[PDB]
Design a protein around this motif. Structure first.
Motif, PDB file in Angstrom:
ATOM      1  N   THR A 157       0.825  -1.203   0.000  1.00 18.32           N
ATOM      2  CA  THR A 157       0.000   0.000   0.000  1.00 18.32           C
ATOM      3  C   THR A 157       0.863   1.258   0.000  1.00 18.32           C
ATOM      4  OG1 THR A 157      -1.401  -1.302   1.490  1.00 18.32           O
ATOM      5  CG2 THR A 157      -2.134   0.903   1.043  1.00 18.32           C
ATOM      6  N   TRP A 158       0.403   2.283  -0.709  1.00 13.77           N
ATOM      7  CA  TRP A 158       1.127   3.546  -0.793  1.00 13.77           C
ATOM      8  C   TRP A 158       0.183   4.725  -0.570  1.00 13.77           C
ATOM      9  CZ3 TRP A 158       0.713   7.137  -5.075  1.00 13.77           C
ATOM     10  CH2 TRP A 158       1.564   8.242  -4.955  1.00 13.77           C
ATOM     11  N   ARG A 159       0.390   5.442   0.530  1.00 13.92           N
ATOM     12  CA  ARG A 159      -0.442   6.594   0.859  1.00 13.92           C
ATOM     13  C   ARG A 159       0.376   7.881   0.827  1.00 13.92           C
ATOM     14  NH1 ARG A 159       0.409   4.167   5.804  1.00 13.92           N
ATOM     15  NH2 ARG A 159       1.638   5.395   7.301  1.00 13.92           N
ATOM     16  N   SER A 160      -0.217   8.939   0.280  1.00 15.01           N
ATOM     17  CA  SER A 160       0.456  10.229   0.187  1.00 15.01           C
ATOM     18  C   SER A 160       0.848  10.740   1.571  1.00 15.01           C
ATOM     19  CB  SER A 160      -0.446  11.250  -0.510  1.00 15.01           C
ATOM     20  OG  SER A 160      -1.715  11.322   0.117  1.00 15.01           O
ATOM     21  N   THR A 161       1.977  11.438   1.640  1.00 10.51           N
ATOM     22  CA  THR A 161       2.464  11.982   2.903  1.00 10.51           C
ATOM     23  C   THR A 161       1.446  12.942   3.511  1.00 10.51           C
ATOM     24  OG1 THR A 161       4.323  13.156   3.925  1.00 10.51           O
ATOM     25  CG2 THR A 161       3.692  13.897   1.769  1.00 10.51           C
ATOM     26  N   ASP A 162       0.843  13.771   2.666  1.00 14.33           N
ATOM     27  CA  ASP A 162      -0.150  14.738   3.121  1.00 14.33           C
ATOM     28  C   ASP A 162      -1.456  14.043   3.492  1.00 14.33           C
ATOM     29  OD1 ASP A 162       0.084  17.845   3.119  1.00 14.33           O
ATOM     30  OD2 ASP A 162      -2.007  17.465   2.558  1.00 14.33           O
ATOM     31  N   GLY A 163      -2.038  13.335   2.530  1.00 14.92           N
ATOM     32  CA  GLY A 163      -3.284  12.633   2.774  1.00 14.92           C
ATOM     33  C   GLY A 163      -4.365  13.005   1.777  1.00 14.92           C
ATOM     34  N   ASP A 164      -4.438  12.255   0.682  1.00 14.62           N
ATOM     35  CA  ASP A 164      -5.433  12.510  -0.354  1.00 14.62           C
ATOM     36  C   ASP A 164      -5.349  11.463  -1.460  1.00 14.62           C
ATOM     37  OD1 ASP A 164      -2.891  13.539  -1.055  1.00 14.62           O
ATOM     38  OD2 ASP A 164      -3.806  14.747  -2.647  1.00 14.62           O
ATOM     39  N   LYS A 165      -4.127  11.089  -1.823  1.00 17.53           N
ATOM     40  CA  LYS A 165      -3.910  10.096  -2.870  1.00 17.53           C
ATOM     41  C   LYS A 165      -3.270   8.835  -2.300  1.00 17.53           C
ATOM     42  CE  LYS A 165      -4.929  10.871  -7.314  1.00 17.53           C
ATOM     43  NZ  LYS A 165      -4.342  12.025  -8.050  1.00 17.53           N
ATOM     44  N   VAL A 166      -3.835   7.682  -2.648  1.00 14.13           N
ATOM     45  CA  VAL A 166      -3.319   6.405  -2.172  1.00 14.13           C
ATOM     46  C   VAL A 166      -3.551   5.302  -3.200  1.00 14.13           C
ATOM     47  CG1 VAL A 166      -5.474   5.819  -1.004  1.00 14.13           C
ATOM     48  CG2 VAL A 166      -3.335   4.729  -0.290  1.00 14.13           C
ATOM     49  N   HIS A 167      -2.533   4.475  -3.414  1.00  9.82           N
ATOM     50  CA  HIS A 167      -2.626   3.378  -4.372  1.00  9.82           C
ATOM     51  C   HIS A 167      -2.187   2.062  -3.738  1.00  9.82           C
ATOM     52  CE1 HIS A 167      -3.150   1.879  -8.441  1.00  9.82           C
ATOM     53  NE2 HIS A 167      -1.999   1.239  -8.339  1.00  9.82           N
ATOM     54  N   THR A 168      -2.781   0.964  -4.196  1.00  8.19           N
ATOM     55  CA  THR A 168      -2.450  -0.357  -3.673  1.00  8.19           C
ATOM     56  C   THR A 168      -2.105  -1.320  -4.805  1.00  8.19           C
ATOM     57  OG1 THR A 168      -4.358   0.141  -2.261  1.00  8.19           O
ATOM     58  CG2 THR A 168      -3.185  -1.850  -1.752  1.00  8.19           C
ATOM     59  N   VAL A 169      -0.940  -1.952  -4.701  1.00  3.59           N
ATOM     60  CA  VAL A 169      -0.492  -2.899  -5.715  1.00  3.59           C
ATOM     61  C   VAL A 169       0.158  -4.121  -5.071  1.00  3.59           C
ATOM     62  CG1 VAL A 169       1.740  -1.751  -5.945  1.00  3.59           C
ATOM     63  CG2 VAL A 169       0.900  -3.220  -7.792  1.00  3.59           C
ATOM     64  N   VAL A 170      -0.354  -5.301  -5.405  1.00  2.00           N
ATOM     65  CA  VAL A 170       0.175  -6.546  -4.859  1.00  2.00           C
ATOM     66  C   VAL A 170       1.613  -6.777  -5.314  1.00  2.00           C
ATOM     67  CG1 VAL A 170      -0.689  -7.923  -6.785  1.00  2.00           C
ATOM     68  CG2 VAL A 170      -0.203  -9.020  -4.585  1.00  2.00           C
ATOM     69  N   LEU A 171       2.442  -7.279  -4.405  1.00  2.00           N
ATOM     70  CA  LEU A 171       3.842  -7.547  -4.712  1.00  2.00           C
ATOM     71  C   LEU A 171       3.999  -8.871  -5.456  1.00  2.00           C
ATOM     72  CD1 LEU A 171       5.740  -6.344  -1.520  1.00  2.00           C
ATOM     73  CD2 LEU A 171       5.370  -5.180  -3.703  1.00  2.00           C
ATOM     74  N   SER A 172       3.072  -9.794  -5.217  1.00  2.00           N
ATOM     75  CA  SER A 172       3.109 -11.102  -5.864  1.00  2.00           C
ATOM     76  C   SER A 172       3.155 -10.963  -7.383  1.00  2.00           C
ATOM     77  CB  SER A 172       1.890 -11.930  -5.453  1.00  2.00           C
ATOM     78  OG  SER A 172       2.197 -13.315  -5.434  1.00  2.00           O
ATOM     79  N   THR A 173       2.497  -9.930  -7.899  1.00  2.00           N
ATOM     80  CA  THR A 173       2.464  -9.687  -9.337  1.00  2.00           C
ATOM     81  C   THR A 173       3.867  -9.449  -9.884  1.00  2.00           C
ATOM     82  OG1 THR A 173       1.840  -7.414  -8.769  1.00  2.00           O
ATOM     83  CG2 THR A 173       0.092  -8.800  -9.558  1.00  2.00           C
ATOM     84  N   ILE A 174       4.746  -8.915  -9.040  1.00  2.00           N
ATOM     85  CA  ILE A 174       6.120  -8.638  -9.442  1.00  2.00           C
ATOM     86  C   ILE A 174       6.839  -9.919  -9.853  1.00  2.00           C
ATOM     87  CG2 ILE A 174       8.299  -7.558  -8.794  1.00  2.00           C
ATOM     88  CD1 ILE A 174       5.839  -5.716  -8.863  1.00  2.00           C
ATOM     89  N   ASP A 175       7.826  -9.781 -10.731  1.00  2.00           N
ATOM     90  CA  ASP A 175       8.594 -10.926 -11.206  1.00  2.00           C
ATOM     91  C   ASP A 175      10.087 -10.719 -10.974  1.00  2.00           C
ATOM     92  OD1 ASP A 175       9.454 -13.242 -12.427  1.00  2.00           O
ATOM     93  OD2 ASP A 175       8.098 -13.036 -14.144  1.00  2.00           O
ATOM     94  N   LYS A 176      10.566  -9.518 -11.283  1.00  2.00           N
ATOM     95  CA  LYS A 176      11.976  -9.190 -11.111  1.00  2.00           C
ATOM     96  C   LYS A 176      12.133  -7.877 -10.346  1.00  2.00           C
ATOM     97  CE  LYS A 176      15.063  -6.684 -14.266  1.00  2.00           C
ATOM     98  NZ  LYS A 176      16.493  -6.731 -13.854  1.00  2.00           N
ATOM     99  N   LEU A 177      13.324  -7.656  -9.799  1.00  2.00           N
ATOM    100  CA  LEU A 177      13.606  -6.442  -9.042  1.00  2.00           C
ATOM    101  C   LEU A 177      14.846  -5.738  -9.584  1.00  2.00           C
ATOM    102  CD1 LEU A 177      12.575  -7.887  -5.677  1.00  2.00           C
ATOM    103  CD2 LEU A 177      12.285  -5.436  -6.076  1.00  2.00           C
ATOM    104  N   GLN A 178      14.746  -4.425  -9.760  1.00  2.00           N
ATOM    105  CA  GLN A 178      15.859  -3.635 -10.271  1.00  2.00           C
ATOM    106  C   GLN A 178      15.779  -2.196  -9.772  1.00  2.00           C
ATOM    107  OE1 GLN A 178      18.324  -5.094 -11.318  1.00  2.00           O
ATOM    108  NE2 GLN A 178      18.980  -4.588 -13.405  1.00  2.00           N
ATOM    109  N   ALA A 179      16.932  -1.623  -9.443  1.00  3.60           N
ATOM    110  CA  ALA A 179      16.991  -0.252  -8.952  1.00  3.60           C
ATOM    111  C   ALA A 179      18.278   0.436  -9.395  1.00  3.60           C
ATOM    112  CB  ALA A 179      16.875  -0.231  -7.436  1.00  3.60           C
ATOM    113  N   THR A 180      18.322   1.755  -9.236  1.00  2.00           N
ATOM    114  CA  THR A 180      19.494   2.532  -9.618  1.00  2.00           C
ATOM    115  C   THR A 180      20.639   2.313  -8.633  1.00  2.00           C
ATOM    116  OG1 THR A 180      18.992   4.561  -8.388  1.00  2.00           O
ATOM    117  CG2 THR A 180      17.870   4.300 -10.454  1.00  2.00           C
ATOM    118  N   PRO A 181      21.890   2.493  -9.089  1.00  2.00           N
ATOM    119  CA  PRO A 181      23.074   2.312  -8.241  1.00  2.00           C
ATOM    120  C   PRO A 181      23.188   3.393  -7.171  1.00  2.00           C
ATOM    121  CG  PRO A 181      23.711   3.224 -10.359  1.00  2.00           C
ATOM    122  CD  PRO A 181      22.251   2.885 -10.465  1.00  2.00           C
ATOM    123  N   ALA A 182      23.916   3.083  -6.102  1.00  2.00           N
ATOM    124  CA  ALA A 182      24.104   4.027  -5.007  1.00  2.00           C
ATOM    125  C   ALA A 182      24.832   5.281  -5.480  1.00  2.00           C
ATOM    126  CB  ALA A 182      24.870   3.368  -3.869  1.00  2.00           C
TER     127      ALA A 182
END
Lengths: 13, 115
Positions: free
Chosen positions: B28-53
């Motif tokens: 679950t992802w909720r806005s810091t302020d409080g108004d917008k929030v989205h929910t996405v299951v992690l199971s749907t994910i297949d691979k993981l990738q991110a930018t370098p440090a």
């Protein structure tokens, strides 16, 4: 034009 | 306050919360302020990738599973019609952003091997 590049920043490292 | 980190989605400052209460879990992802929030299951994910440090812009990326049931990639050339899912989130810390990816790797790795 930074949309395509957005995929590179995450694609590679 | 279990399993959570500052995650910015769609240029929106908000906090993410992982729920490992169910098999496929739920992120679950909720806005810091409080108004917008989205929910996405992690199971749907297949691979993981991110930018370098080293990258000044700390951000993570998640790739969903492909549809190897209806889609067809020819026999020698790959003729894929659709495209895989790929969602990225903007973070403001390598420690927090790393805590999410490290966790997602265990969630999928545990649900991908168990089947």
């Amino acid at each position: 034009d930074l949309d395509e590049s957005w995929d590179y920043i995450f694609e590679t490292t | 306050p279990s399993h959570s980190g500052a995650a910015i989605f769609e240029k929106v400052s908000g906090i993410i919360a992982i729920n490992e209460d169910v098999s496929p879990a739920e992120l679950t992802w909720r806005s810091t302020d409080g108004d917008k929030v989205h929910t996405v299951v992690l199971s749907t994910i297949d691979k993981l990738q991110a930018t370098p440090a080293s990258s000044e812009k700390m951000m993570l990326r998640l790739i969903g599973k492909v549809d190897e049931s209806k889609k067809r990639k020819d026999n020698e050339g790959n003729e894929v019609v659709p495209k895989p899912q790929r969602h990225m989130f903007s973070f403001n810390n390598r420690t927090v952003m790393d805590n999410i990816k490290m966790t997602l790797q265990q969630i999928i790795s545990r649900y991908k091997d168990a089947d």
